[PDB]
């Protein structure tokens, strides 16, 4: 038995109409505490097995949202309260130094293990402090053990991208004038894990001496396989330029019968299919 205490408490906020405001609040204890905040535009997002909670108001409408909000915490021992004030202005009423997003993040795809750098440039007076959110919850780069870090520019740099880094990112600029949210941007993390297989097999043929036949080989997969030709030991396709996906063996003037082999190959496998001219 032990009463709960807040690891993080909510701060007061000054928002802009049409934009977003978020209030964060989590606590720890034994047994675990359960946090609660107290409408279509209001939404709650839990974390840390319910012990954390984020209130998100979007879009902001003034002065209806302009109130105080409490974050309670239930426990077998007791419960505590924490306050946080919301203010909301309109675009035509924003102070000169209110934060503005000059360049926000944008829809991006990153292949697994590669680096994703979610850009964000913001002005204001004083210069705003950039935080980031992902799936309506704040990003904590310090928790990543060096893999994720914010650059001096505000950019969120995600090295060694993994599947869980996929999600809806938005950069947030805060200063004494208030808080401005960017247009959201989805990050997609691409895994390429499909072994190569033939889509169009080479056809066997019978021909007269010269004797013009093209033989087509088409293979698919993710990554997309190279496709080269061989007649037994000797390979016809030169390495310098080897086709990906599709390779059509043009035979000009043929005299004797021979068996041609198509090899499709990627990092996930090698496949073979034979075409025999008679």
Footprint on this chain of its own copies (rule: CB under 8 A): 107-111, 113-114, 186, 188, 190, 192, 222-226, 239, 242, 244, 265-267, 270
Contacts of 29 (CB under 8 A, 6+ apart): 2, 3, 4, 5, 75, 77
- The tokens 């808080």 sit on which residue? 179
b/e 249-274 (16+ beta carbons within 10 angstroms → b) = bebeebeeeeebbbbbbbeeeebeee
Residue 197 binds Cl ion, judged by CB under 5 A:
yes
- Single residue of 142, 176, 212, 267 touching ligand NAG by CB under 6 A: 212
Question: What distance in Å separates the CA atoms of residue 21 and residue 57, rounded to the nearest whole number?
Answer: 5
- Pick 63 or 211: Cβ nearer ligand NAG: 211
Residue 244: DSSP 8-state: B
Taking CB under 5 A as the criterion, which residues in 164-183 touch Cl ion? 182-183
Shortest distance in whole angstroms from residue 157 CB to its own copies: 15
Contact (CB, 8 A) for 71 and 35: yes
Among 258, 269, 270, 272, binds ligand NAG (CB under 6 A): 258
Q: How far is CA 241 from CA 145, 179, 226, 227, in A?
A: 42, 54, 10, 11
Q: Is 101 in the site for Cl ion (CB under 5 A)?
A: yes
Is 201 one of the binding residues for ligand NAG (CB under 6 A)?
no
Footprint on this chain of ligand NAG (rule: CB under 6 A): 212-214, 250, 257-259, 276
Footprint on this chain of Cl ion (rule: CB under 5 A): 10-11, 23-24, 101, 104, 130, 154, 182-183, 197-198
């Amino acid at each position: 038995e032990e009463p709960p205490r807040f690891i993080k408490e909510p701060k007061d906020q000054i928002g802009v109409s049409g934009g977003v405001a978020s209030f964060v609040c989590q606590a720890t204890g034994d047994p675990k505490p359960r946090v609660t905040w107290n409408s279509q535009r209001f939404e709650t997002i839990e974390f840390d097995e319910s012990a954390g909670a984020v209130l998100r108001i979007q879009p902001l409408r003034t002065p209806r949202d302009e109130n105080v909000y409490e974050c309670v915490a239930q426990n077998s021992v007791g419960e505590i309260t924490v306050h946080a004030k919301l203010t909301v202005l309109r675009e035509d009423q924003l102070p000169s130094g209110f934060p503005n997003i000059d360049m926000g993040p944008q829809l991006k795809v990153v292949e697994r293990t590669r680096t994703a750098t979610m850009l964000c440039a913001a002005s204001g007076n004083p210069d705003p402090e950039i935080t980031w959110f992902k799936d309506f919850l704040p990003v904590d780069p310090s928790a990543s053990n060096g893999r994720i870090k914010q650059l001096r520019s505000g950019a969120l740099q995600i090295e060694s991208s993994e599947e869980t880094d996929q999600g809806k990112y938005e950069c947030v600029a805060t200063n004494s004038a208030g808080v401005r949210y960017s247009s959201p941007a989805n990050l997609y993390v691409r895994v390429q894990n499909v072994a190569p297989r033939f889509s169009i097999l080479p056809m066997s043929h019978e021909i007269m001496p010269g004797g013009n036949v093209n033989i087509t080989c088409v293979a698919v997969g993710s990554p997309m396989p190279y496709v080269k030709w061989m007649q037994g030991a000797e390979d016809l396709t030169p390495e310098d330029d080897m086709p990906v996906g599709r390779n059509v063996l043009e035979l000009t003037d043929v005299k004797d019968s021979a068996n041609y082999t198509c090899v499709a190959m990627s990092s996930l496998g090698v496949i073979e299919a034979v075409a025999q001219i008679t």
